[PDB]
Write a protein that binds this ligand. Structure first.
Ligand SMILES: C/C(=C\CNc1ncnc2[nH]cnc12)CO
Ligand SMILES: C/C(=C\CNc1ncnc2[nH]cnc12)CO
Lengths: 266, 263
């Protein structure tokens, strides 16, 4: 009611929204760094070491025990690069056929594939699935290996849970990767892709829901990579259309842009 | 005077709080990644048989993930060796367990904690019995008894003589019961994943580069003993100051940051 109270009413919204934005950004950052460590893990213990020290069992165990290191991630998995020329050989050795993600059926002929060979049990259904048979995942895989850095997809509904989230992807390179490599060289030296599923719908709601004063505030997160086409990353809704605040978000991928919008319930 | 006194205070609080936050977050990040290393050793060295990790692999993985541990000068893994195992152990590694102070053959002890894995930045730790140093020894004991990360008091590290603190995680054998007793933890102890927080150098590099650093004096104290505050960072000096909170993760220890203006 009061006018001076309105000022403080905004100050509160600003503080609450900014804090929640910092928490989200930090938690995301922490998870990205540990996934990065997993990519290095696979490179060191699977490819560099002879013989490999990593099988599905080992990957499952280590990732499970370190799940607390990756908050906001529902699971991690490693997909290996497989060129069509190698497919038969790859499938005979693993004793299973590469499958599409849409139906889990034997994949048709493609130039290359990205089937998951290692997976955290939380996402064990990814095993043998070709990560390139999904458009979001395919684009992430390409940009990942071309840039040599972590990358994020647009928000989309994940496999099995259908939860709205985003996928994080790190490239894994063979030792043959030249220093100061070109994009062409990065592609030629690609071994595989370490991916993480950011279950935003479930895990972000869980983080926010526990915070004091949550019932009083409405929190929305947007992918604004495309100015004219903002994509809802999190949030549903009846709210206070008179006042709002925009908090800054940086999820680490220069190719994507995000922001948080907060309002009062009423 | 006088409204400037207020701003002068508000600036000190803000400057000190931010430095404290930065310091705590960096420490926290380093601790979490050392925890992952402890888990890594458990899985690859003990859960897998034969062992699927060695000095070569440890050195590579820790070097490549060095960025993950901002305030650590290096990390290493010391394995638990009881005396009756010493001959076999030394014969297997082809070296003798050495003392920390002189690097001489260790006298007979009930047990030892020789480093078998090391990041090349602390390669000199290899074969050294971490129990032959009091700070390290106590850290090792409290680590395996509590089952959680532990920190030492500030003390000068090997080789560099830089003032800092050691972080230690316990690594347990699979034979560790759940909801175990201290006696059970000790019996299941496999080794100790340790890291050296080079405060004197790395913290200085962290804070000394911040804008306005020349205007304020910054101290970090180990106040585990209120009557005997230990300097962890800053000079050895005893009006307008401010105390910023610090939580390094070890309930056994207490810390605080103190910021003050020069004039
Ligand atoms: C394995 C990798 C990505 C992981 N992607 C996903 N991980 C988990 N669920 C999903 N639904 C759609 N894509 C995913 C490699 O880039
Ligand atoms: C390997 C472990 C401790 C590491 N301790 C040290 N690590 C590095 N430099 C030092 N100087 C004195 N002690 C140290 C196990 O707790």
């Amino acid at each position: 009611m009061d006018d001076a109270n309105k000022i403080r009413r905004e100050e509160v919204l600003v503080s609450m929204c900014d804090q929640r934005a910092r928490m989200l950004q930090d938690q995301f950052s922490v998870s990205v760094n540990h996934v990065h460590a997993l990519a290095i893990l696979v490179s060191t213990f699977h490819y560099h070491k002879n013989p490999s020290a990593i099988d599905q069992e080992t990957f499952a165990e280590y990732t499970a025990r370190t799940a607390f290191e990756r908050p906001l991630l529902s699971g991690v998995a490693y997909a290996e690069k497989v060129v069509n020329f190698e497919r038969e050989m790859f499938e005979r050795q693993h004793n299973w056929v590469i499958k599409t993600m849409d139906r889990g059926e034997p994949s048709p002929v493609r130039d290359e594939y990205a089937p998951v060979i290692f997976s955290q049990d939380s996402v064990s259904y990814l095993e043998s699935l070709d990560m390139m048979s999904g458009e979001e995942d395919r684009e992430n895989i390409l940009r990942a290996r071309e840039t040599g850095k972590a990358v994020l997809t647009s928000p989309f509904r994940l496999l099995e849970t259908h939860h709205l989230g985003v996928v994080l992807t790190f490239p894994v390179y063979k030792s043959s990767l030249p220093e100061n490599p070109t994009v062409e060289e990065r592609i030629a030296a690609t071994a595989g892709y370490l991916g993480g599923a950011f279950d935003v719908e479930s895990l972000v709601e869980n983080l926010l829901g526990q915070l004091a004063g949550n019932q009083a505030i409405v929190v929305h997160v947007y992918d604004i990579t495309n100015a004219s086409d903002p994509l809802v990353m999190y949030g549903n809704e009846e709210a206070d259309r008179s006042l709002s605040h925009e908090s800054k978000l940086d999820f680490g991928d220069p190719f994507r842009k995000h922001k948080m919008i907060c309002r009062y319930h009423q």
